[PDB]
Structures are given as structure tokens and as C-alpha cells.
Amino acid sequence: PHCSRNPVLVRGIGRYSRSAMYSRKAMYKRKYLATVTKPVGGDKNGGTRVVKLRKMPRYYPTEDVPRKLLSHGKKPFSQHVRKLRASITPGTILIILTGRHRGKRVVFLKQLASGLLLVTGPLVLNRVPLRRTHQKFVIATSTKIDISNVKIPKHLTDAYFKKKKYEITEQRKIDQKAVDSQILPKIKAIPQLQGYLRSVFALTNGIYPHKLVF
Amino acid sequence: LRIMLKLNPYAKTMRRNTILRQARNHKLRVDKAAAAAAALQAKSDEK
């Protein structure tokens, strides 16, 4: 096989024309069991018991519903394109709005395959473990830390965090130790970030969200 | 886009040509503007 050979400049529009691709691809020279038989195991039987799979149903419902037409779209959730807000980047500081951790400030880790943001606050700072969160319920601050050359374990997929009393397994505890062990030194790099991450966001008698800068 | 093509197949070529033409024209404007900027500090040193 080969690459697309047609660089895309606009969604659904190729760079090269129909006749241009004829030359580039060089078409001017490149032209042209239901049933199984098994023995029975008894004499005067014949050993010719032909058995068929997918046998006829033993019961039919009184009425059936007709099948629906075709849609040429509406892909299942597993293959939807994951869209990430431009202000979200690895290492930025986020604010939780709806969960048990309302107002907590956390540092954004890798984004997962389901589109949920794998995020963590340093568990020694705000008692927030490695959790998934939705970008639509998170406010992005302009404060960023460099989480490059930081190793996130490969086994932190969505299935890892999917729900099954809750007990903290050792694997959750060990994985938490590994990640923050290399995150905290970067937290200490810039001053006063501990107090920023420890405190919670809240609205007061003054400021309004549409005037604030994030 | 695909609906438009089923009525006017030629519209694909016009759209492709327009995008390519504007990409070239946008490129041409940003060098001579840079050349004018490249002229500014040329007179800043020679003075």
C-alpha cells in the first residue's frame, strides 16, 4: 500500500485535480458452510447425521417491527473524533466545577482516548487523586507548568478508571506515587504554586466571571 | 459541499482554484511586507 498521495487542503477537497491524479498515480500504464456431517456412533443407523447450524427458531412472536432505513453516518461513540479546547494543554492548571472537588485547582495531564481529561492534583496538596474529568465542566487558567519529559504510565487508559464500598487498590496508590513524585519538583520550581493549588476558587461580593482573565 | 457537487460538479474545481489562488496571494503579500520590514532596518543601520 501507499499513502493517500492527495494532500488535503480543505476537508473533502484534494489539492490535485482529477486529471493530475491520473498522471501521478500512473494509471496510463496500470490499466486492466451451513451443514457439517459427523458420525452417530451406533450400528444400523448409518453414521450420516447431517447437522446444520443456525437452526430455525422454535417460536415466532405474534408481531414484529420493520427494520429502519440506512443513515450513512451516526458513528458509535467509540469512533467519534475527540475535540479538545485550544486553551487546554498538558501542564495547564484547571478548575473543577461540578464534582465532589468543586473549586479545586489541578494540573492537566494527558487527555484520554474517550475525550475525558486525565487530570490530577498533587494528592499531598489538595487530596485529589488521579481522576478523569470532562473539559466542558472545567475552567482553564493561564498558569502552565512544563510537564514534558514526564513519564505517564501506559496502563492509565479509560478502562483503568472505569467504575466497577469503594476501596483504594494498591495499583491506584502505587501509580499515584509514581506520577506526583516527578510532578512536585516542577511545582516547587515556581514560587507560591503550592498555595495556589491548595486554595479553592470561589466568587465573592466583587468580581464577575465575564470580567475575569483565565 | 457534496450536495453542491451533485448539482454542479464544476464547483469543485472553482473552489479548489480559489483556495489555491488565495494561498498564493496571501503568501505574496507577506514577503513584500516583510521585505518592506527588511527595508526598514536596512536604513536603520546605513542611516
Side-chain angles (χ1 to χ4, degrees):
Chain A
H2 198 197
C3 293
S4 174
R5 210 189 273 110
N6 200 338
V8 292
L9 75 170
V10 153
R11 190 178 61 91
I13 287 302
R15 151 42 164 290
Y16 296 137
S17 76
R18 183 174 283 205
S19 69
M21 220 87 168
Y22 190 90
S23 296
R24 284 170 64 87
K25 290 157 67 179
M27 269 57 278
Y28 45 82
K29 67 188 185 181
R30 290 180 179 176
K31 48 172 46 172
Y32 301 93
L33 196 68
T35 70
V36 61
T37 73
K38 47 178 175 184
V40 54
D43 90 2
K44 71 224 173 306
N45 286 271
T48 48
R49 288 314 179 269
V50 189
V51 293
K52 68 175 294 171
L53 276 300
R54 206 160 84 165
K55 281 180 281 183
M56 296 279 204
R58 74 186 67 67
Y59 172 117
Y60 284 68
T62 52
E63 312 83 341
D64 267 348
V65 294
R67 67 192 181 191
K68 188 66 181 293
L69 300 165
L70 308 175
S71 286
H72 88 78
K74 285 77 183 170
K75 296 176 56 44
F77 175 72
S78 62
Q79 320 98 301
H80 291 170
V81 172
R82 312 299 190 219
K83 47 232 163 183
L84 179 56
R85 202 150 65 237
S87 64
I88 274 44
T89 174
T92 192
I93 305 290
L94 304 182
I95 302 176
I96 300 92
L97 297 176
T98 165
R100 194 182 289 107
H101 302 283
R102 296 164 282 268
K104 303 277 191 69
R105 285 147 180 154
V106 290
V107 51
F108 165 72
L109 262 48
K110 172 184 62 180
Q111 181 196 7
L112 299 180
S114 65
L116 290 170
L117 314 179
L118 165 59
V119 76
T120 186
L123 196 62
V124 294
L125 289 193
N126 44 13
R127 274 80 176 269
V128 170
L130 278 162
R131 299 188 79 215
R132 302 183 299 176
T133 188
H134 207 269
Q135 71 179 311
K136 217 181 189 188
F137 295 111
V138 159
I139 292 330
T141 69
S142 52
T143 309
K144 316 217 188 280
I145 84 165
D146 172 343
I147 65 164
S148 283
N149 66 22
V150 160
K151 294 327 107 177
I152 291 80
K154 317 326 83 178
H155 63 274
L156 292 182
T157 66
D158 293 277
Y160 180 84
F161 294 101
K162 182 173 168 60
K163 284 186 180 183
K164 76 84 187 171
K165 279 74 177 175
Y166 226 98
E167 296 70 24
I168 305 168
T169 83
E170 76 63 14
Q171 183 65 221
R172 303 288 285 264
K173 210 168 295 186
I174 296 322
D175 276 320
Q176 178 79 37
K177 200 65 65 66
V179 164
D180 315 49
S181 68
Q182 58 187 355
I183 288 296
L184 269 303
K186 305 169 153 323
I187 294 323
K188 320 291 188 68
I190 68 101
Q192 276 171 305
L193 200 56
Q194 298 178 177
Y196 199 163
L197 258 53
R198 284 183 58 90
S199 66
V200 301
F201 173 79
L203 300 168
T204 56
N205 328 92
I207 56 58
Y208 311 102
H210 76 275
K211 302 293 302 320
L212 297 180
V213 168
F214 296 103
Chain B
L1 178 55
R2 299 268 290 280
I3 293 297
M4 170 90 252
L5 300 190
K6 296 284 103 174
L7 286 309
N8 187 359
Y10 186 69
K12 188 178 182 179
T13 78
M14 293 186 3
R15 189 86 65 89
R16 171 169 49 231
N17 291 327
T18 298
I19 298 157
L20 288 176
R21 181 173 59 251
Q22 299 198 328
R24 290 194 303 271
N25 295 331
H26 175 69
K27 183 177 175 65
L28 268 69
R29 284 168 63 85
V30 305
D31 43 286
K32 66 182 290 185
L40 196 139
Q41 85 306 8
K43 298 287 111 175
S44 299
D45 199 3
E46 293 172 354
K47 84 186 71 176

Short mmCIF file of all heavy atoms in Angstrom, two decimals, chain B residues 3-5 7-9 11-12 15-19 22-23 26-31 33 35 37 40-41 45-46:
data_model
loop_
_atom_site.label_atom_id
_atom_site.label_comp_id
_atom_site.label_asym_id
_atom_site.label_seq_id
_atom_site.Cartn_x
_atom_site.Cartn_y
_atom_site.Cartn_z
N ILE B 3 -23.48 17.99 -1.53
CA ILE B 3 -24.75 18.32 -2.17
C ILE B 3 -24.52 19.25 -3.35
O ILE B 3 -25.09 19.06 -4.43
CB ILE B 3 -25.72 18.93 -1.15
CG1 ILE B 3 -26.13 17.88 -0.11
CG2 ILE B 3 -26.95 19.49 -1.84
CD1 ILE B 3 -26.88 16.70 -0.70
N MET B 4 -23.67 20.27 -3.17
CA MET B 4 -23.42 21.22 -4.24
C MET B 4 -22.79 20.54 -5.45
O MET B 4 -23.12 20.85 -6.60
CB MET B 4 -22.51 22.34 -3.73
CG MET B 4 -21.99 23.27 -4.81
SD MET B 4 -23.10 24.67 -5.08
CE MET B 4 -23.80 24.26 -6.67
N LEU B 5 -21.88 19.59 -5.21
CA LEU B 5 -21.21 18.90 -6.31
C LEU B 5 -22.17 18.08 -7.14
O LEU B 5 -22.02 18.01 -8.37
CB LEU B 5 -20.08 18.02 -5.77
CG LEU B 5 -18.99 18.75 -4.98
CD1 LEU B 5 -17.82 17.82 -4.70
CD2 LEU B 5 -18.53 19.99 -5.73
N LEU B 7 -25.13 18.79 -7.94
CA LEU B 7 -25.78 19.69 -8.88
C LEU B 7 -24.79 20.34 -9.83
O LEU B 7 -25.04 20.40 -11.04
CB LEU B 7 -26.57 20.77 -8.13
CG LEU B 7 -27.88 20.41 -7.44
CD1 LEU B 7 -28.81 19.67 -8.39
CD2 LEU B 7 -27.67 19.60 -6.16
N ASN B 8 -23.66 20.82 -9.32
CA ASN B 8 -22.64 21.49 -10.12
C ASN B 8 -21.30 20.83 -9.85
O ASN B 8 -20.55 21.25 -8.96
CB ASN B 8 -22.59 22.99 -9.82
CG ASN B 8 -21.66 23.74 -10.75
OD1 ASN B 8 -21.03 23.16 -11.63
ND2 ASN B 8 -21.57 25.05 -10.55
N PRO B 9 -20.96 19.77 -10.60
CA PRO B 9 -19.65 19.14 -10.42
C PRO B 9 -18.48 20.09 -10.67
O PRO B 9 -17.43 19.93 -10.04
CB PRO B 9 -19.67 17.99 -11.44
CG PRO B 9 -20.73 18.36 -12.42
CD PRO B 9 -21.76 19.12 -11.65
N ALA B 11 -18.19 23.01 -9.67
CA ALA B 11 -17.95 23.85 -8.50
C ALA B 11 -16.77 23.38 -7.67
O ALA B 11 -16.17 24.18 -6.96
CB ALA B 11 -19.21 23.90 -7.63
N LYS B 12 -16.42 22.09 -7.75
CA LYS B 12 -15.26 21.59 -7.02
C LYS B 12 -13.97 22.24 -7.54
O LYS B 12 -13.12 22.64 -6.74
CB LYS B 12 -15.18 20.07 -7.14
CG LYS B 12 -14.11 19.44 -6.27
CD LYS B 12 -14.13 17.92 -6.40
CE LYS B 12 -13.10 17.28 -5.49
NZ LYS B 12 -13.12 15.79 -5.60
N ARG B 15 -13.78 25.93 -6.41
CA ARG B 15 -13.40 26.03 -5.00
C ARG B 15 -11.93 25.70 -4.81
O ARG B 15 -11.22 26.40 -4.08
CB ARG B 15 -14.27 25.09 -4.16
CG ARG B 15 -14.11 25.28 -2.66
CD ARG B 15 -15.01 26.38 -2.14
NE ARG B 15 -16.42 26.04 -2.29
CZ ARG B 15 -17.13 25.39 -1.38
NH1 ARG B 15 -16.60 25.00 -0.24
NH2 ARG B 15 -18.41 25.13 -1.63
N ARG B 16 -11.44 24.65 -5.47
CA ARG B 16 -10.04 24.29 -5.35
C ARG B 16 -9.13 25.39 -5.89
O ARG B 16 -8.13 25.74 -5.26
CB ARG B 16 -9.77 22.97 -6.09
CG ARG B 16 -8.30 22.63 -6.20
CD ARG B 16 -8.09 21.21 -6.69
NE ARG B 16 -8.88 20.91 -7.87
CZ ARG B 16 -9.67 19.84 -7.99
NH1 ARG B 16 -9.79 18.96 -7.01
NH2 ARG B 16 -10.35 19.66 -9.12
N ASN B 17 -9.48 25.94 -7.05
CA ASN B 17 -8.67 27.01 -7.63
C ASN B 17 -8.68 28.25 -6.74
O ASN B 17 -7.64 28.90 -6.56
CB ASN B 17 -9.17 27.35 -9.03
CG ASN B 17 -8.89 26.25 -10.02
OD1 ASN B 17 -7.89 25.54 -9.92
ND2 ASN B 17 -9.77 26.09 -11.00
N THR B 18 -9.84 28.60 -6.18
CA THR B 18 -9.93 29.78 -5.34
C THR B 18 -9.06 29.65 -4.10
O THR B 18 -8.34 30.58 -3.72
CB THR B 18 -11.39 30.03 -4.94
OG1 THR B 18 -12.17 30.27 -6.12
CG2 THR B 18 -11.50 31.23 -4.02
N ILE B 19 -9.10 28.48 -3.45
CA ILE B 19 -8.29 28.27 -2.25
C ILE B 19 -6.80 28.34 -2.59
O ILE B 19 -6.02 28.97 -1.88
CB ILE B 19 -8.65 26.94 -1.58
CG1 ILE B 19 -10.12 26.95 -1.14
CG2 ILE B 19 -7.76 26.68 -0.38
CD1 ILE B 19 -10.71 25.57 -0.99
N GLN B 22 -5.86 32.09 -3.41
CA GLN B 22 -5.74 32.94 -2.23
C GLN B 22 -4.53 32.57 -1.38
O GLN B 22 -3.91 33.45 -0.77
CB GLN B 22 -7.02 32.87 -1.40
CG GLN B 22 -8.26 33.35 -2.13
CD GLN B 22 -9.40 33.67 -1.20
OE1 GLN B 22 -9.55 33.05 -0.14
NE2 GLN B 22 -10.22 34.65 -1.57
N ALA B 23 -4.19 31.28 -1.33
CA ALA B 23 -3.00 30.87 -0.59
C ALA B 23 -1.74 31.48 -1.20
O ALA B 23 -0.86 31.95 -0.48
CB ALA B 23 -2.89 29.35 -0.56
N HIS B 26 -1.96 35.35 -0.52
CA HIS B 26 -1.62 35.63 0.87
C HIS B 26 -0.12 35.49 1.10
O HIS B 26 0.48 36.29 1.83
CB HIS B 26 -2.38 34.69 1.80
CG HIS B 26 -2.00 34.84 3.24
ND1 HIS B 26 -2.30 35.96 3.98
CD2 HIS B 26 -1.34 34.00 4.08
CE1 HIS B 26 -1.84 35.81 5.21
NE2 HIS B 26 -1.25 34.63 5.29
N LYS B 27 0.51 34.48 0.48
CA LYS B 27 1.95 34.33 0.62
C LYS B 27 2.69 35.51 0.01
O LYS B 27 3.61 36.04 0.63
CB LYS B 27 2.41 33.02 -0.03
CG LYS B 27 3.91 32.78 0.14
CD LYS B 27 4.35 31.45 -0.44
CE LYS B 27 5.86 31.31 -0.37
NZ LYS B 27 6.34 31.27 1.04
N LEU B 28 2.28 35.96 -1.18
CA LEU B 28 2.98 37.05 -1.84
C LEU B 28 2.92 38.34 -1.03
O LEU B 28 3.89 39.11 -0.99
CB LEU B 28 2.42 37.28 -3.25
CG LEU B 28 3.10 36.54 -4.40
CD1 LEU B 28 2.85 35.05 -4.36
CD2 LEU B 28 2.64 37.13 -5.72
N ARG B 29 1.78 38.60 -0.39
CA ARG B 29 1.65 39.83 0.39
C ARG B 29 2.58 39.83 1.59
O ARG B 29 3.11 40.89 1.97
CB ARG B 29 0.19 40.02 0.82
CG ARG B 29 -0.70 40.51 -0.31
CD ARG B 29 -2.18 40.42 0.05
NE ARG B 29 -2.51 41.27 1.18
CZ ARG B 29 -2.82 42.56 1.08
NH1 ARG B 29 -2.84 43.17 -0.09
NH2 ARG B 29 -3.12 43.24 2.18
N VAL B 30 2.80 38.67 2.21
CA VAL B 30 3.57 38.63 3.46
C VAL B 30 5.08 38.63 3.26
O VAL B 30 5.81 38.74 4.25
CB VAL B 30 3.19 37.42 4.33
CG1 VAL B 30 1.69 37.41 4.61
CG2 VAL B 30 3.66 36.12 3.70
N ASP B 31 5.59 38.48 2.03
CA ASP B 31 7.03 38.67 1.87
C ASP B 31 7.37 40.11 1.54
O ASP B 31 8.31 40.68 2.12
CB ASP B 31 7.62 37.75 0.79
CG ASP B 31 6.78 37.67 -0.45
OD1 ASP B 31 5.73 37.01 -0.41
OD2 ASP B 31 7.15 38.29 -1.47
N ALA B 33 5.68 42.65 2.31
CA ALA B 33 5.53 43.34 3.58
C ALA B 33 6.74 43.08 4.48
O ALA B 33 7.24 44.00 5.14
CB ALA B 33 4.25 42.89 4.28
N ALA B 35 9.66 42.27 3.22
CA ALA B 35 10.72 42.98 2.52
C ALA B 35 10.72 44.46 2.88
O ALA B 35 11.79 45.06 3.05
CB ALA B 35 10.57 42.79 1.01
N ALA B 37 9.62 45.56 5.74
CA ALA B 37 10.23 45.48 7.06
C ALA B 37 11.73 45.23 6.95
O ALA B 37 12.52 45.80 7.70
CB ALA B 37 9.56 44.39 7.89
N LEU B 40 13.27 48.45 6.38
CA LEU B 40 13.27 49.43 7.46
C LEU B 40 14.58 49.41 8.25
O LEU B 40 15.22 50.46 8.42
CB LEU B 40 12.08 49.19 8.39
CG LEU B 40 11.72 50.33 9.34
CD1 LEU B 40 10.21 50.50 9.42
CD2 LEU B 40 12.31 50.09 10.72
N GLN B 41 14.99 48.24 8.73
CA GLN B 41 16.24 48.17 9.48
C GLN B 41 17.46 48.27 8.57
O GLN B 41 18.57 48.51 9.06
CB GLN B 41 16.31 46.89 10.32
CG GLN B 41 16.82 45.62 9.62
CD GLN B 41 16.08 45.25 8.33
OE1 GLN B 41 15.25 46.00 7.83
NE2 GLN B 41 16.40 44.08 7.80
N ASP B 45 20.46 50.86 9.95
CA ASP B 45 21.90 50.66 10.11
C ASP B 45 22.70 51.58 9.19
O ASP B 45 23.66 52.22 9.63
CB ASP B 45 22.26 49.20 9.85
CG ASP B 45 23.61 48.82 10.42
OD1 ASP B 45 24.25 49.68 11.07
OD2 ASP B 45 24.04 47.66 10.22
N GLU B 46 22.33 51.63 7.91
CA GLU B 46 23.04 52.50 6.97
C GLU B 46 22.86 53.97 7.34
O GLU B 46 23.82 54.74 7.30
CB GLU B 46 22.55 52.23 5.55
CG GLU B 46 22.91 50.85 5.02
CD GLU B 46 22.26 50.55 3.69
OE1 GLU B 46 21.43 51.36 3.23
OE2 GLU B 46 22.57 49.49 3.10
#
